[PDB]
Amino acid sequence: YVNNKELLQAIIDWKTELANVRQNDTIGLAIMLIAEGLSKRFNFSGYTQSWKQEMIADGIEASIKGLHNFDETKYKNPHAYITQACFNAFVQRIKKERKEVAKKYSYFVHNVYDSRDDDMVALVDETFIQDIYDKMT
Amino acid sequence: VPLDGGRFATSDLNDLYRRVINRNNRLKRLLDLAAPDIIVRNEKRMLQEAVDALLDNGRRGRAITGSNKRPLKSLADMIKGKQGRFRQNLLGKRVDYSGRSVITVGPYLRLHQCGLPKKMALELFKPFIYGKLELRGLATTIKAAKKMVEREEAVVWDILDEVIREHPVLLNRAPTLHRLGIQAFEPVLIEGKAIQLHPLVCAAYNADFDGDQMAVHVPLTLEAQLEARALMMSTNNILSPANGEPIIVPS
Amino acid sequence: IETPITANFREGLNVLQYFISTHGARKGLADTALKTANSGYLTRRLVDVAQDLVVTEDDCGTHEGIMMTPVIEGGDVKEPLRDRVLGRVTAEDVLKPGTADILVPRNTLLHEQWCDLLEENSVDAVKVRSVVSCDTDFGVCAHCYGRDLARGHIINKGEAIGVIAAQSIGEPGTQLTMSSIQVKNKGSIKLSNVKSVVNSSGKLVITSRNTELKLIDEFGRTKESYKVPYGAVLAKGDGEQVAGGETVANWDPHTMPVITEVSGFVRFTDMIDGQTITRQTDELTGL
Amino acid sequence: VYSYTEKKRIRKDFGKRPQVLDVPYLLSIQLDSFQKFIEQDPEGQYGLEAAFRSVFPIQSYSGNSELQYVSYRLGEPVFDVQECQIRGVTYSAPLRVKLRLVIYEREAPEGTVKDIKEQEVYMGEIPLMTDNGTFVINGTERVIVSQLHRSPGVFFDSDKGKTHSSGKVLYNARIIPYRGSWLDFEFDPKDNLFVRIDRRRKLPATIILRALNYTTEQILDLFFEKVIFEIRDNKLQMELVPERLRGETASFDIEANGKVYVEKGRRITARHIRQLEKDDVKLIEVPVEYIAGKVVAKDYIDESTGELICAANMELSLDLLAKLSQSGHKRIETLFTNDLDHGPYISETLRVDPTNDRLSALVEIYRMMRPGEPPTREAAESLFENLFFSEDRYDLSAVGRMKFNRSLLREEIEGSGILSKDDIIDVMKKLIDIRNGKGEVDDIDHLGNRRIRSVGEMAENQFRVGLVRVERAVKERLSLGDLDTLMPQDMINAKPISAAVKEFFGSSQLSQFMDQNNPLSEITHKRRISALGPGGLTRERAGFEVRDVHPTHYGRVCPIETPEGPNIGLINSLSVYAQTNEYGFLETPYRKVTDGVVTDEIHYLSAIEEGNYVIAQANSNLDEEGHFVEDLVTCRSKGESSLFSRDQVDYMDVSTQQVVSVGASLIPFLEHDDANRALMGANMQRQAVPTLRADKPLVGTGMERAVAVDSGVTAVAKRGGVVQYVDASRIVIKVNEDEMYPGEAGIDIYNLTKYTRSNQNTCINQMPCVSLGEPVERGDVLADGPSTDLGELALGQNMRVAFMPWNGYNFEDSILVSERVVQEDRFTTIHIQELACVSRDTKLGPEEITADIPNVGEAALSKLDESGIVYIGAEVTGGDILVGKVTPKDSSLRVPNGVSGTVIDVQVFTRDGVEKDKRALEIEEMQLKQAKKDLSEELQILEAGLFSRIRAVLVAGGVEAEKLDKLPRDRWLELGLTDEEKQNQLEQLAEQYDELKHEFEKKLEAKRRKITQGDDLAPGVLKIVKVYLAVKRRIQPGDKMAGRHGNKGVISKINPIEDMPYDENGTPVDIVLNPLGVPSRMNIGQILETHLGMAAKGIGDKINAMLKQQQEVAKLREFIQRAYDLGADVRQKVDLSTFSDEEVMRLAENLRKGMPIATPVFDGAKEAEIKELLKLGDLPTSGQIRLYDGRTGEQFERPVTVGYMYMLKLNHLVDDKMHARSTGSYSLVTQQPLGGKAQFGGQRFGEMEVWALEAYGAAYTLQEMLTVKSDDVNGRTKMYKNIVDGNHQMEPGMPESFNVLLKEIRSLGINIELED
DNA sequence: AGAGTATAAAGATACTGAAGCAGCC
DNA sequence: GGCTGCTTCAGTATTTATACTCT
Ligand SMILES: [Mg+2]
Ligand SMILES: [Zn+2]
């Protein structure tokens, strides 16, 4: 990946500038690289490209917002810092999406008022099972 | 969720819309963060890509799939294909007052009549029956008439074989190749669940009797009855409009 | 395959023959499936392109049309004139083969009576009206069309002929699939687009490419037609009767006869080896 | 000798050829697959061991911390099959894997393990296969259809025809791994050479060539040969062997040794080549013009300047030659070239090669794979390296290695799973040699290039995927060493493995409900070879060339049995004798034809071993000695068929039926029939619905045993013995002695299955075919499933039928049926719709099952009991309450509209920990009463031996036989017995007794546990109630019927009995077919069969008369003997002389309604023997008799044909079709009436119907058929009102789907509107 | 609803058409 | 510089594994 040393210099420079407002684009590219890299982890990169892009954009916005608070005199590795930020934003996004899906289910399983007879069992007593499965939270 | 019984659908447009707004919102907030313009650029790129995939997916390089790897249906794909509004709901739509059955011969029929099982005929002409009942006064409310019809009392059958008297039906087969795949008739009631069909007309329909099926429609207004009686009757179409050769050849 | 199936459905086909027949049958079935498939699309395109022609006149007011004439593939006739014009309004009055003796007026609908009438009188070709040359804006006139073909009378004003045409052409679709002149008949000969010369062997060789023979009967209606290429030696001249079995002309198809049509001389001029021609001793005769 | 279940009814068997190989077990595919998927085996091989040893062992990120595999085991199903079938759980088993993690000494690979830690882990829960090759997923019964795909390896495709339309052919080569990525070489109209990976954009082949660290000189050294020019006195005489000059022109003076051989302008002849070669010329003068177009292989370097006097792959010249000879360079290397023997195709690619060094090639590859990311050395390096040489992301299974090393004509069949440079090189060399003309392309549909998967292989692959994910996870968690608290359990997870296995089995394209309405539909749904699914073709995508029969299908796939329709030839069904080779290629038996004999030492042959020899055909005569009686034998050698000598032959087929499948090996007189109609015949024969009573097939193929036995609907004896207690719903057999081991005294207790809803709503219920007190042996049939009879198969009823027109009531294909068929009720069937209701739990509290539901009159409630459940046996019509259910504010399970029936069973399940009802207690307690019974019986039969020993010891010691029978038999120790060893024996046997009592208490208490317990349910369900309605629908005008020979028809009129054509003897016929159906649809069989049928029935009425009025047994013996000999030299040879004078009466009692006749397919019965049998009766040999009318009684002239044909009934029952609609449920998006019969859906008024209704001047009906009757909302309400009010009139309006279209376009940026 | 967060380098359709694009006389 | 042969692309026939701490 991108070097760990140059990021130190770039962030020190931007922090000194903050003591006078915008980040150098080098550190922005570095953040994008590390976010998109973590996107290819094994626990992620497993389900769908419709969510994954939203997770990555969210994590990038989160890390950019949060780089405001990086201690420069101690903890000289920001690799783990940005990793943790994007990780947290990832998991928040995954929660929101899963609960929106559960909303769809829970609206479904509460509608036995239709036309007429012979309603199913599997196709209806399976959405319930997913409708409860994430409700363990 | 559309909720047309049974399986539940998704109405996937929602999904797409959300993402757009999502990214749009995100963009605005970066305009309150003054990010590296590389990231603002990447976000603008994502926004363009999302609006595109919403308007007409697949036109850009890769189409996005929700699950089962089946590319989700963008907005435009509600108009293209065999399944847009055009080839699915504006030209050919499903219709009320209609039925379907298997067909049989009845070589005792004349040429301008066909069999029509009592059950089906009772189901199709229902509002006519309610009208005649509430005319004769054999009931007061609509539900009275419905229960009466439901108990199949001995009075409904005379009402039925009265209304049928000159009320033509339109019979049709599945692949309607040429003009003679849909023809009018005057039905006679039958004790069964199958449609009788005059053995001479099974050439226009190209209908064997290996278990073919047919559909029955019912004209309503005066004009439709007059047209079915004067134009599409089985005793007006004996000359194939392709070439004036007769089409009622005993087979 | 070389060996055929020397049994039948009253004896018993043994194994191999049953195998081979099976091959053929499955091929047929797959053909049927895909044939319905293609024909559906074809008839869809058909009904779409026309889709809008409505008979909106009664007479476009014109005197044009096609010279309807019985088709002949060269030997047997493929269709008598009676059908091609059966129920179709003629353009101009038709003359008996007694020229200046009309047989039917100019603007009459030809039902069976006039069909037989022209049939016996040995009429050959008729300028009949048509739809291709009709003179209507947004539609076609009734007369240009002809007869309804579902009712024995002229087509009424308003019928959607385009759709019925589309369906009629498309429906049978699923039924589809996926030398010399040895005249046999007796009649007069006619030539067409002739340039020729009498040979040094008594016969007349024709030396054009628009050439064509039209064998009429004794009456005046053409019954046969045949193509003769550049330089074919006719056995007989024009106007002479002919019997069945004997040829009337034969050429060499395995070369291109390029005889000149004058008297004079020739040379080996502009024919120089190395740059233009080659020395060649004939490997079969030697000259 | 015959099985004792066969001496009840023998079948007269024609056919003269003695068979030598009994048909093999018809389900060996599924069983023999799922055997090699769960079996502990050494040397890796197949099974799980392969998946484990291919992922494990794994180690940490150099933390000296390993996680290795030890062993595995499958514990046990917690439930037997039927309980899974009932409750709704997956008959499965748990996978306990013994694992071990080891962490070595830190900074010491050679060092000791710092700590080992072993364990056994629960991972996943895998389903299991019954003894009938099926799975039970959620109550239901699934099956996994096999698959037919393209073998792994290399294929040299031609791609002839439409390439460039110029006419020139191409060639290309695909290398296909089992897993990994394909690689494609292909030529060019410009005769170049290109490569592409994963069907992507094109590239030059030299790219791949260099990226293996190949220099241009090495390339040119590999591919082309050499020609050397060496400095001479003059002209640079070239060393030469004349072989490269055969037929080449003399570009100079072909002269040497002071003598000329060939003059310039004259091409060197092959005889001149021989002259040169015998002369042995080596050097020749060559003009310096002839060496103008030669290209140099290896670059040359000067000596003094030390420069590039010439490079590699350079076009030679004059000055270049002079400079080369100038620098002292004697030798000059160029390539030998031609145009028909050694085509120069590499050099041109090197010239168009935009690459020179390996690094730029890797960059090119990376860019062609990954766009957007600019080059990066090690990135592209690792990409290319692991793309084709990673043990992980690319593999050829051993079959791939076999096909590879065989296509290249190498011999070693064992290689790596990764590629190798030399191998790609040899691929390219072979492709080139094809381009020259040495070698030919491979044909695709060939059956040496396709192979069948199974359930074992697919399951194993899904298991590998699960293991891969879990391995990534567990490797991750191994970078977080917290030792002495991480046992090898919390490191490992099992959820993804289980999710993958359950997702495969429970959902796929190759996992279908068992087609279960026939003892044949099953056994044909398991021998189905589908060519679809994952890694296969597609309906609208496959081509006309795979869908046809290849001359290599002879004995491996049935040619006549496929489903007609949008997918023919894709789902062909396997043959009868078709095994599967070691690698998945089908094979077939054949018989070794040695020098002059046809022995019986048989061999199995694949599609490639066969295509070398000459195999005779099945029906080829030979005289009891092996030698063919003929001298010219028909044979098929290599996709051909021709006569052959008596000594060329090598193999000969086994039996005449090994060409057809089993789903069509049943149709008799097949060889007398068409092909289309036999196809339709088989595809209908797999649809017969089981009728009320079953009856043997009067004329059959002799292959009706092995279809009933080998399927599972029957009930077969495990081991022999003597029947002891039969009963309408259970059988109990006392086992024999030697068939009984020392323990387990043993009585087999077959609990027959009663009315149970099959997968298509058709009852099945076995019934006993024995009676109290008769011997059985191992394998004899005891009960008969649906559509079986005395052990044979029976799909329909055989009727008396006459071939003649009848007033047109059988006009096109309709059928006319009497009323001795609707009365005898021999075509009635039973249907079992299942309904279920569940007690969920939403907000405001859950719902309940109280018998008190709101705002409904008592009239409805009358049928309900206290719990809220209708009684067993009640009769219910449409729209009735079966279970009460109230929602937190009614949700009572009604009867689905339309269906009727009589409740026959109710089930109730409750989440253990919910207040129970009464009905549950009732069903539980009855289940206890039934469950104690078998154990009680085994108890009381076992107690006998102990007390027998008691009597044996009590006889010595003053036996008193008159008291031991007074007080109960438990008092057999208290009598006078002296204090001897015998009293200790009495105490010991008493303790044995009490021990057995303890054992049986334990067993019955375990059963009580399994029953009185609750059960795991869907969390959120309180109780689940299930109802089992049932109907009996008989026959009517509209149903479908069909013979076995593709003659189907809709029964049209039901005929009074006194109107049917009766013969001179009062006996009316049942069915009146149509003769016109035969001569075009050339199915002669259905008629020819009809003759034999009558003949058979003729021998029935010859016994029935002989037997109804009494008659001694010797006469029946003699007559049946006569009837059983009756033929040419046939194989049957049964003699009643050996029978025991009593069972003969039973045989006659079975025959008394017809003597069943066998007919092997291509060994059938000729006409002569049919007529001989007809004469053994008394009927006319013509087979036609005179009939009379029933309406007039006046004879029919022209004697007609009557006989007995085996008619079926196909389950397109008309009441399932008939459907109408007045007004129902519309949709919301577009308010068009819904579609289908399940919903109250209208009819589809498509395009074509609009065109046709438009061709007429029909302008109003078309209007109302798409505005009022479908969509215009206001319009259709006003229509309903005006129809009720006696006013036929409409107000059109404007449709709704149109406005949907507007708002949908206008939702794009397209302003679409309407003007004034 | 928000906000601080510090190991990790992680694939077999087939056919038809029209503009684009390198090249040539 | 215009003209021309490849070349590439567009068109048609149910169900997704895991914070933390405030505040
Ligand atoms: Mg049919
Ligand atoms: Zn006109």
Side-chain angles (χ1 to χ4, degrees), chain D residues 1234-1292:
Chain D
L1234 282 165
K1237 196 193 183 305
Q1239 297 86 304
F1240 203 67
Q1243 278 301 135
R1244 172 65 170 156
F1245 190 55
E1247 271 176 312
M1248 298 180 184
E1249 282 91 21
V1250 159
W1251 300 336
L1253 182 81
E1254 194 171 38
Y1256 313 89
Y1260 277 74
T1261 180
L1262 187 60
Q1263 166 163 58
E1264 79 177 8
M1265 272 191 151
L1266 52 85
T1267 176
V1268 168
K1269 279 169 58 183
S1270 199
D1271 282 346
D1272 203 290
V1273 285
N1274 194 314
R1276 73 164 162 265
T1277 62
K1278 282 313 173 176
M1279 195 70 202
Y1280 207 97
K1281 280 189 191 168
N1282 272 11
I1283 287 314
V1284 171
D1285 303 327
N1287 183 1
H1288 298 77
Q1289 195 171 35
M1290 60 175 282
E1291 162 49 49

Side-chain angles (χ1 to χ4, degrees), chain B residues 173 207-212, chain D residues 680 813 1040 1048:
Chain B
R173 203 180 170 266
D208 48 331
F209 290 125
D210 296 320
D212 283 28
Chain D
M680 294 180 63
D813 275 327
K1040 181 181 281 193
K1048 54 150 50 63

Side-chain angles (χ1 to χ4, degrees), chain B residues 94-95 98, chain D residues 1219-1221 1225 1233-1243:
Chain B
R94 288 174 189 257
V95 184
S98 74
Chain D
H1219 155 62
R1221 170 181 157 103
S1225 42
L1234 282 165
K1237 196 193 183 305
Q1239 297 86 304
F1240 203 67
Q1243 278 301 135

Side-chain angles (χ1 to χ4, degrees), chain D residues 41-241:
Chain D
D41 181 65
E43 293 177 350
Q45 294 300 320
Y46 324 92
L48 286 169
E49 285 279 316
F52 283 162
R53 300 190 198 181
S54 89
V55 159
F56 290 3
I58 191 54
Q59 326 191 26
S60 62
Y61 289 73
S62 47
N64 279 137
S65 318
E66 186 192 1
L67 182 44
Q68 40 176 326
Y69 158 71
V70 181
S71 161
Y72 78 113
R73 190 184 41 93
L74 302 89
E76 211 50 50
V78 312
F79 280 137
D80 192 277
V81 198
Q82 307 77 238
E83 309 81 325
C84 318
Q85 181 84 231
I86 292 154
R87 203 151 293 98
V89 303
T90 189
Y91 177 72
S92 85
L95 184 47
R96 291 299 183 285
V97 53
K98 179 161 309 310
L99 279 189
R100 162 184 292 122
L101 61 86
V102 285
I103 312 158
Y104 293 167
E105 167 172 281
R106 189 55 214 181
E107 311 157 322
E110 92 287 331
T112 174
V113 63
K114 195 63 61 59
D115 47 348
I116 81 183
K117 196 58 63 68
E118 73 188 6
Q119 208 185 343
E120 63 172 14
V121 190
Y122 169 106
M123 54 166 37
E125 182 79 14
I126 57 181
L128 279 188
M129 162 165 293
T130 76
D131 208 352
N132 304 328
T134 65
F135 306 125
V136 195
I137 291 315
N138 288 7
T140 77
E141 182 142 350
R142 299 296 195 91
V143 71
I144 301 312
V145 284
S146 279
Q147 205 181 35
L148 185 78
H149 59 59
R150 304 173 64 187
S151 90
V154 57
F155 296 145
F156 288 130
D157 174 23
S158 167
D159 188 2
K160 59 204 72 73
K162 70 172 289 153
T163 188
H164 199 269
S165 71
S166 302
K168 62 170 299 185
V169 312
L170 310 194
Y171 298 101
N172 55 4
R174 313 186 67 89
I175 182 66
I176 289 191
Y178 196 101
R179 74 195 171 101
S181 181
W182 306 327
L183 196 49
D184 281 329
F185 301 85
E186 54 202 46
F187 280 160
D188 206 6
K190 218 57 179 177
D191 269 21
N192 294 327
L193 177 47
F194 305 84
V195 185
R196 75 173 62 175
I197 314 175
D198 190 15
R199 296 282 302 163
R200 292 183 189 280
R201 202 179 63 259
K202 209 188 314 304
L203 270 194
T206 179
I207 286 177
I208 309 295
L209 293 170
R210 287 187 182 283
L212 315 188
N213 289 267
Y214 278 161
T215 71
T216 303
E217 56 175 32
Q218 288 156 335
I219 288 190
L220 305 184
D221 191 287
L222 281 179
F223 282 51
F224 311 94
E225 286 208 352
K226 299 286 192 156
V227 169
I228 310 309
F229 301 104
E230 53 89 19
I231 306 288
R232 277 312 304 180
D233 304 332
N234 56 6
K235 280 308 186 172
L236 268 291
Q237 280 202 330
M238 58 179 284
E239 181 42 82
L240 184 64
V241 63

Side-chain angles (χ1 to χ4, degrees), chain D residues 27 37 127 185 290 334 386 423 428 487 505 566 590 678 723 742 850 888 906 958 1223 1254 1280:
Chain D
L27 261 185
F37 168 85
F185 301 85
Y290 182 58
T334 195
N386 70 354
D423 280 329
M428 305 177 77
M487 295 292 302
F505 275 93
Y590 294 108
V723 176
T850 79
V906 172
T1223 288
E1254 194 171 38
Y1280 207 97

Side-chain angles (χ1 to χ4, degrees), chain B residues 2-5 13 17 55 75-76 78-79 85-108 117 119-120 123-124 126-128 130-132 134 142 146 167 170 172-183 191-194 196 199-200 202 207-213 215-225 227 231-232 237 251, chain D residues 677 680 807-814 1033 1036-1038 1040 1048-1052 1081 1212 1214-1215 1217-1224 1226-1230 1232-1236 1239-1253 1255-1262 1264-1271 1276 1279-1280 1283-1286 1288-1290 1295-1298 1300-1301 1304-1305 1307-1309:
Chain B
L3 212 51
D4 279 338
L13 268 184
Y17 264 102
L55 295 201
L75 193 146
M78 307 294 192
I79 318 170
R85 289 301 163 271
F86 279 131
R87 278 179 58 155
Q88 194 86 257
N89 293 68
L90 273 295
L91 289 174
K93 36 184 67 178
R94 288 174 189 257
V95 184
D96 276 331
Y97 294 84
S98 74
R100 166 182 213 84
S101 314
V102 184
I103 49 186
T104 40
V105 278
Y108 65 90
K119 292 95 185 165
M120 295 182 36
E123 216 63 22
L124 307 163
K126 277 183 164 176
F128 306 103
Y130 299 174
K132 285 308 284 300
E134 296 278 38
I142 307 309
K146 310 174 82 63
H167 216 76
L170 267 50
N172 169 38
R173 203 180 170 266
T176 304
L177 292 196
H178 59 269
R179 189 177 79 168
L180 274 63
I182 161 177
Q183 308 191 15
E191 289 291 21
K193 297 186 184 180
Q196 310 286 319
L200 286 197
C202 73
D208 48 331
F209 290 125
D210 296 320
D212 283 28
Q213 312 178 160
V216 196
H217 305 252
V218 171
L220 309 189
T221 43
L222 292 176
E223 290 84 313
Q225 299 178 71
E227 288 178 18
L231 303 189
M232 303 162 50
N237 307 8
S251 162
Chain D
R677 291 298 170 180
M680 294 180 63
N807 267 93
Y809 275 108
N810 51 340
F811 169 45
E812 262 290 343
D813 275 327
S814 315
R1033 49 187 79 258
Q1036 45 185 347
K1040 181 181 281 193
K1048 54 150 50 63
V1050 159
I1051 172 176
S1052 62
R1081 309 171 170 95
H1212 307 267
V1214 54
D1215 184 1
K1217 313 303 182 51
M1218 195 203 76
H1219 155 62
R1221 170 181 157 103
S1222 157
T1223 288
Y1226 308 79
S1227 293
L1228 302 181
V1229 285
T1230 178
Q1232 298 195 2
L1234 282 165
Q1239 297 86 304
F1240 203 67
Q1243 278 301 135
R1244 172 65 170 156
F1245 190 55
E1247 271 176 312
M1248 298 180 184
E1249 282 91 21
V1250 159
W1251 300 336
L1253 182 81
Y1256 313 89
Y1260 277 74
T1261 180
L1262 187 60
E1264 79 177 8
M1265 272 191 151
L1266 52 85
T1267 176
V1268 168
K1269 279 169 58 183
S1270 199
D1271 282 346
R1276 73 164 162 265
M1279 195 70 202
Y1280 207 97
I1283 287 314
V1284 171
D1285 303 327
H1288 298 77
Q1289 195 171 35
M1290 60 175 282
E1296 170 77 3
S1297 200
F1298 179 58
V1300 157
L1301 170 84
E1304 191 175 78
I1305 284 181
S1307 88
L1308 278 161

Side-chain angles (χ1 to χ4, degrees), chain C residues 30-103:
Chain C
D31 180 23
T32 57
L34 306 187
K35 173 182 316 174
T36 77
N38 278 320
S39 42
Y41 177 38
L42 172 67
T43 182
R44 164 148 184 262
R45 283 175 281 161
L46 262 300
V47 57
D48 192 351
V49 57
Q51 172 272 332
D52 57 23
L53 274 188
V54 55
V55 172
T56 177
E57 270 181 340
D58 44 3
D59 204 340
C60 74
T62 201
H63 318 122
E64 283 50 44
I66 297 190
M67 188 65 51
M68 262 305 188
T69 183
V71 61
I72 293 93
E73 60 87 36
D76 47 27
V77 307
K78 295 315 294 316
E79 181 193 7
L81 184 70
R82 179 166 198 277
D83 309 334
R84 297 192 70 103
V85 68
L86 172 51
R88 195 171 325 193
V89 173
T90 179
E92 54 198 288
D93 54 282
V94 58
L95 297 173
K96 217 185 196 319
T99 81
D101 304 340
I102 71 167
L103 192 41

